[PDB]
Symmetry: D2
Subunit: 46 residues, 4 copies
Amino acid sequence: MQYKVILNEAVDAATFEKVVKQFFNDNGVDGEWTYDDATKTFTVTE
Amino acid sequence: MQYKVILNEAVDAATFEKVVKQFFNDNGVDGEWTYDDATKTFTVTE
Amino acid sequence: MQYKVILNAVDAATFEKVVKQFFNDNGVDGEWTYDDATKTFTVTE
Amino acid sequence: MQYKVILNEAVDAATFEKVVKQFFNDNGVDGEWTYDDATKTFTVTE
């Protein structure tokens, strides 16, 4: 299962990253936020 | 590089799948359309 | 900005709750909804 | 429904984009290929 969150002020981004990393740490799991390779989407003009 | 196309301006999906599969065949590549594990997105209630 | 987390050890239900909770704490309410299915053209060789 | 295609063999990325765009134009809908906003994935260290 894949989960996605989209941020934009509302909620801070770094704080969010913290929270999620913490969640994993609290479950005994280590990891970091990796930047994904760029990707393209076909956008309809209308 | 990853490419993403989004359908639903109503266009036949089966035709699209076919056209693309064909395209790969023409370029000497075999493959099928496989399903991806679901993705949930956190949706703001607005 | 877009964030992605993959699960599957670690309970999915609680993760959702924690995250939803996090947002409620920052004043924004929301729910986890499914995205419409995705198919990937899987190369054989 | 969403479709995903990943490349880089003999299949050139430019022609794939064109074929897809062509497919849509042929169905009466115009559009262009745009780059997505950056995405970060929390990568487990094991």
